[PDB]
A paper describes a structure:
The full length mature HA1/HA2 trimer crystal structures are as follows: (1) A/Fort Monmouth/1/1947 solved at 2.95 Å resolution, (2) A/Jiangsu/ALS1/2011 solved at 2.35 Å resolution, (3) A/Almaty/32/1998 solved at 2.05 Å resolution, (4) A/Hickox/JY2/1940 solved at 1.95 Å resolution, (5) A/Netherlands/002P1/1951 solved at 2.5 Å resolution, and (6) A/Melbourne/1/1946 solved at 2.55 Å resolution. Comparing the structure of A/Denver/57 HA in complex with C05 Fab to our six other HA structures showed differences in the C05 antibody binding site. Finally, for Ser240, the most notable amino acid change was in A/Almatu/32/1998, which harboured a Pro at this position. The antibody C05 Fab failed to bind many of our other IVA HAs, as examined by analytical size exclusion chromatography. Our other IVA HA structures all contain an insertion near the C05 Fab CDR3 binding site that appears to prevent antibody binding, via either insertion of an Asn which becomes glycosylated to physically block C05 binding, or insertion of an Arg, Lys, or Ile into the C05 binding pocket. Although the insertion of either a glycosylated residue observed in the electron density of our structures (A/Netherlands/002P1/1951 and A/Fort Monmouth/1/1947) or of a bulky side chain which partially changes the loop conformation (A/Jiangsu/ALSI/2011, A/Almaty/32/1998, A/Hickox/JY2/1940, and A/Melbourne/1/1946) appears consistent with the loss of C05 antibody Fab binding by analytical SEC, rigorous mutational analysis and quantitative binding experiments would be required to prove these are evasion mechanisms. Interestingly, these insertions do not affect the identity or the positioning of the sialic acid binding residues, allowing these strains to bind the cell surface receptors while eliminating nearby potential antibody recognition sites.
Hemagglutinin (HA) is an IVA surface protein that allows the virus to attach to host cell receptors and enter the cell. HA is a homotrimeric glycoprotein, with each monomer composed of two regions: (1) the head, comprising the receptor binding domain (RBD) which is crucial in viral attachment, and (2) the stalk, that is responsible for viral and cell membrane fusion in the endosome. Following endocytosis, HAs undergo conformational rearrangements due to the low pH of the endosome, leading to membrane fusion.
Residue numbers in the entry:
A (entry chain C): 2 to 325, 330 to 491
B (entry chain A): 2 to 325, 330 to 359, 362 to 495
C (entry chain B): 3 to 325, 330 to 359, 363 to 491
């Protein structure tokens, strides 16, 4: 007798997916949604190299610590890289006021131009510009000083009241940095500045601060009992800044005209720079991927997959792999799949006097391929790209804000890890049920064509009561079986 | 010859919904969950108009910038509106310390009583109350000053140490504002206050601050090289505030007894006030809606739909529209729907010698389930109540960016939640109808058994004569099979 | 003469909800929401909390004389303030960065209180004896903090003092001090002689100078003076130098800190008991393995996730129908069998001479067990929540913190409730599908050899004994014999 059987695809795949109902289900086709590979290097971003501070931190760079001269030509960058445990910062000990806020400002700067805000040789005619070096800021085995600040002291035995103004005609914000020095004794105050009770005043149209030396016994920091506090402000285009002092001013020498940009950040990384280009950079390495998720690093620059805690995110696209359910066909009354059917997901096996063969049902297969492809793309589309994450740093009196920031990051990460894993589990179950349903619907369509002209053999097969040649088989496969003829 | 067919509804609906598997599925019935329409106007909230500061900001209002006099009678409001056109704040240049914190405080204030904390004519017998006007704060082309502060100066080249106390007897918090003036020269310091080295002290039971004038050369802001810094504190009921000064005090004259309320806020909007009432206000306009979501504005006042970024949220309630699946019936062996069946979702078409009719039982059970599902989804989407604005000064960029990460993160999640739930439930709803049609076909097929031929297209060809009385029996579920096995 | 396929029923009154239906009575279900606690404060992993009682953190660390019972405190698992702690900074003034100090103590597992500047010998040129006050009274006498020392002039001299402490404790040392602000210049001279005094406090990373601000002030607890309190964490090996010409309320005792994990500060009016717990809330301890709880958002230890839900119940069994998407349950098989006590799906036979289908039932049990376990696994336990407090000039931060907490709580309450509703619908459909598949297997195995009644039963044309009935149940039915 001649027979036609309805069955489904199988292959040599060893891909496994999970559902809520079952773990480690081997499937014929699947897609990985989780990027876990990077190149372990620092790369250019959209063709623009980062700024590598190397042995310096942000403080050492912007103040011009003399160990940081290699950073002086710095113009434009795609992101800024601090290395772990930068050893060159504010060499002369003291407090850098609103330092974290300054770093947050630099996080949106794409370029700056360093310029001589107060030319050293001409700006300070009544004061000494030459004696301001210190062993606290040594370089090349000699006492030195910041490149961007100027330690003014008395000339002869006079420190007259100074007043210096700068008008911002750069057409951009100007970052102005200065310092206030705090001697360790009144005699030192007089030796450096003559005036016993001095002050510094710095005023713009939106900045206004006055500083008084606070002289006291202090522990030595790198053998220095003095202190030098550092301050900064953003001078708006067209605005004027006025410095007034009777002592203790560490005057601006160079300042920075800032250009604002999009998508920059400051990261800490021990990775090395290479001649690579990427659209996505993390502190551990660059990512070249189109997947929706990644488990490499929560800190990203550019356009990156969303970070999740997951170790596996795999969506099934094909069928259970059974090479010899909710709808009962796959792994049900059709107990196994057909490795012999290599051209579709669902199809037919026939056996007549002319021979036998496998043929996939193109219509049901292509409709299932279209649905599953839309499902995967729809899932990916809902997982919007992760753009440059903004670093957040807090000082030792901002622990509450630090913990709040951590709670926010941790909470969002919890939710997206849960969303990603759960959606994949649910959709994997639905995808397997979808295939089971398609096999079931295909079987029932063939059963409705043949009616009493064949007996059901139980395994998805029909044993014809007449002879069914290759032309007759094709009629069943394309759905035009002429029942009255037999 | 006589036939009865099982089928499903179709109509002229052009509504489309999406699923994970398919996009733009035309369906017979659906509900929009996303509000995108507003009236473009500012309205009253629960019958109470907002406070429109107009050309003034909060500082100009509370300090009493003379250009803001129309705001002085202000008593109660439902929300506060700043416009992008704020030209009137602190007319005399200076810093307003903790301004953002003050605005945050005002956001929960439903009414204030402006009152004379230190009557000008009696509080300061030893100082000059008349010389304290300035071109920086003009009104009507004449030099003036804040309506709520008093610029005390020396009288007869003397400025004695002043000490003035006020006991809060209002039974509410009292907001007290004052200023400290910083001359641009010692000559000016002496011309105004005589004393070269003055101070201001302001102390309550929980506030304690001392101010020293800082004289220096400064750039002119609005033709003024001096500065005046503004300060405020909340004086608890029963507490006393004591002002002590030897110069430079811009003294409180009027203060504010504050009443706390719920659901108020401060917004920035250039929309206009109209004679309308709403339960939900945004800066772009008021919303009149019961839908769970809206894409009009993240800033809301009152009881509002949840803001999402989505541009379409549509839940299918009916069936795919097929006018002349997981279970194989709809778009399956029953290849199409019936536009002729206008009274239900699933039913029967007959053709005897003597017509569409809906099956009330299967249709009404599906109606209840779909109605329960949509309501359950909507109930899970809790209403959005008044959002609190967040403003930060130029040394709070980190906190500003944290607030933005918080707002963006929640917005991402709810947009994802809303869109995904609709896609998932749309697919299950379509499959639900497919199951229902399938189950009804099998029920009728189980009633008819061998008394009819199964045509395969959802139709049964009767082997006996089936009149309108026989057809009704099939729909009823009361088909008498043995009675017609003998009528072949 | 008959073989029937059917499903389990029992006397369970449990109800679950789906998106489609409310209050569906089901045969088996599992509560995921913990709502019971013991109403007591307990030990955490064997270690008792620090009960501040009538004192707040300030009164404890300053050594408010009403807080003497707290002086030997060494180690604890968490810290408990009670509502309306009436003993704090007895002498009125500002405690600078108080909330930050509390945040620091939230990760402290133990401290060692020690005499940083021995009273009788550290201040040879100043008076250590006159520093008591009615603001800090104890036992009906004027008194003072136990951890600070109110230095004053000796005779009529208050020379410049300089005192240093080197931190040799191998741990961070918490140092506290105060600055006194008299109400008049005469009081300044009576106490400290010097009219214009200052205090300086400097370590390697702290540097602050303080000037007395003398002014008319309202009396707080009959005291018009003020005393402001300051603190710093002195790193191991670092030195702190105090320098003063008056007004210094000197450190007397300081605290060597040991850092720990999972501690916190809570406010609770519950009482301590001789109980041990892995999860503590301010309302009581929790003894539970459930993923969610609605008792309190503030937790210590390893706790179920807090949600606002009032019911979270997952159906595991079937709809209970005693005497659907796939059409079997509550469909052509109109009801369940209370007689079938050994499985979810099975058969009832009736020959001349109940049994559950073990294979489908056990496959259903494994699937449902995996689904419930997978749900709980995705709901990560809630670890110790870190309290957040803000001063009266930090209202924006307080509201931002509240937006975060409320925002996360909304999302987790939504996620938990929705997942349960969705999976409840899928579980019922799962059982419906299984019964249908079992019915379809029996109908295809016995083929035309039995009458198909319509209630899931088949009427045999032949005699089918206990050996034959087992053939149908075992899937080994020999159709050719009939
Ligand atoms: C589901 O069952 C619960 C419990 O029987 C119902 O809750 C009752 O709701 C009414 C509302 O007016 C209250 O008066 C009762 O006190 C509630 N009972 C309990 C025990 O809380 C609920 O209404 C039912 N829901 C539906 C849709 O039928
Ligand atoms: C798996 O099957 C594919 C397709 O038949 C073949 O190309 C590949 O070599 C096979 N690999 C193994 C390991 O069997
Ligand atoms: C680089 O930094 C990472 C992150 O802290 C760290 O785990 C890793 O050990 C570092 N590598 C080296 C060589 O220090
Ligand atoms: C990423 O990998 C693909 C794989 O072919 C390659 O075409 C592409 O150039 C890669 N991108 C980068 C930036 O190297
Ligand atoms: C369908 O099968 C019949 C039978 O062989 C054949 O004649 C006809 O051309 C087929 N049509 C298509 C579109 O394959
Ligand atoms: C459908 O028909 C009704 C009745 O004529 C009409 O009001 C409605 O606009 C029609 N819809 C479309 C899309 O044509
Ligand atoms: C759906 O229809 C709209 C309008 O006809 C069209 O713009 C859109 O591209 C279609 N497809 C999707 C996926 O929205
Ligand atoms: C304010 O007006 C400008 C242009 O006049 C417009 O672009 C902006 O959207 C308006 N703001 C609001 C909140 O409607
Ligand atoms: C708001 O919508 C309702 C819809 O029922 C409508 O009746 C009402 O006229 C609309 N306007 C107001 C002000 O309620
Ligand atoms: C409910 O039925 C079970 C099954 O036998 C029985 O063990 C239990 O005692 C019954 N409980 C009640 C309250 O009827
Ligand atoms: C604890 O405080 C709550 C606050 O509402 C109160 O309801 C409860 O009675 C208090 N318990 C005790 C034991 O004081
Ligand atoms: C905690 O509950 C379990 C049962 O849920 C019980 O066996 C155990 O004894 C309980 N422990 C305590 C300390 O109450």
């Amino acid at each position: 007798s001649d027979t036609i059987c309805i069955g489904y695809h199988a292959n040599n795949s060893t891909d496994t997916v999970d559902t809520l109902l079952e773990k480690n289900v081997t499937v014929t086709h699947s897609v990985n949604l989780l990027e876990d590979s990077h190149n372990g290097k620092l790369c250019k971003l959209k063709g623009i190299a980062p700024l590598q501070l190397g042995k310096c931190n942000i403080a050492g760079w912007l103040l011009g610590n003399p160990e940081c001269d290699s950073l002086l030509p710095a113009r434009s960058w795609s992101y800024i890289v601090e290395t772990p445990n930068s050893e060159n910062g504010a060499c002369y000990p003291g407090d850098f006021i609103d330092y974290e806020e300054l770093k947050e400002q630099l996080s949106s700067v794409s370029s700056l131009e360093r310029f001589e805000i107060f030319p050293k040789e001409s700006s300070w005619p009544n004061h000494n510009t030459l004696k301001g070096v210190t062993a606290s800021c040594s370089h090349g085995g000699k006492s030195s000083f910041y490149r961007n600040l100027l330690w003014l002291t008395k000339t002869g035995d006079s420190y007259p009241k100074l007043t210096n103004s700068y008008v911002n005609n750069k057409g951009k914000e100007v970052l102005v940095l200065w310092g206030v020095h705090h001697p360790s004794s009144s005699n030192e105050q007089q030796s450096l500045y003559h005036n016993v009770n001095a002050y510094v005043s710095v005023v713009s149209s939106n900045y206004n601060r006055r500083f008084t030396p606070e002289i006291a016994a202090r522990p030595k920091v790198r053998d220095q009992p003095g202190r030098m506090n550092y301050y900064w402000t953003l001078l708006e285009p067209g605005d004027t800044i006025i410095f007034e002092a009777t002592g203790n001013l560490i005057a601006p020498w160079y300042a920075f005209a800032l250009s604002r940009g999009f998508g920059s950040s400051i990261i800490i990384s021990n990775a090395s720079m290479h001649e690579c280009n990427t659209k996505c950079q993390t502190p551990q390495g660059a990512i070249n991927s189109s997947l929706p998720f990644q488990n490499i690093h929560p800190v990203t620059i550019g356009e990156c997959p969303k970070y999740v805690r997951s170790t596996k995110l795999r969506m099934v696209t094909g069928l259970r792999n059974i090479p010899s359910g909710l709808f009962g066909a796959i792994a049900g009354f059709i107990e196994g799949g057909w490795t012999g059917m290599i051209d579709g997901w669902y199809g037919y096996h026939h056996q007549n006097e002319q021979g036998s063969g496998y043929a996939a049902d193109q219509k049901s297969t292509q409709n299932a391929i279209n649905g599953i492809t839309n499902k995967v793309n729809s899932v990916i589309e809902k997982m919007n790209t992760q753009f440059t994450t903004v670093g957040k740093e807090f000082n030792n009196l901002e622990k509450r804000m630090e913990n709040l920031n951590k709670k926010v990051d941790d909470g969002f990460l919890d939710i997206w890890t849960y969303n990603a894993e759960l959606l994949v589990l649910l959709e994997n179950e639905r995808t397997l049920d979808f295939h089971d349903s398609n096999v079931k619907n295909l079987y029932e369509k063939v059963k409705s064509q043949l009616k009493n002209n064949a007996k059901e053999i139980g395994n998805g097969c029909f044993e014809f009561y007449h002879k069914c040649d290759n032309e007759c088989m094709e009629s069943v496969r394309n759905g035009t079986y002429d029942y009255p003829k037999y």
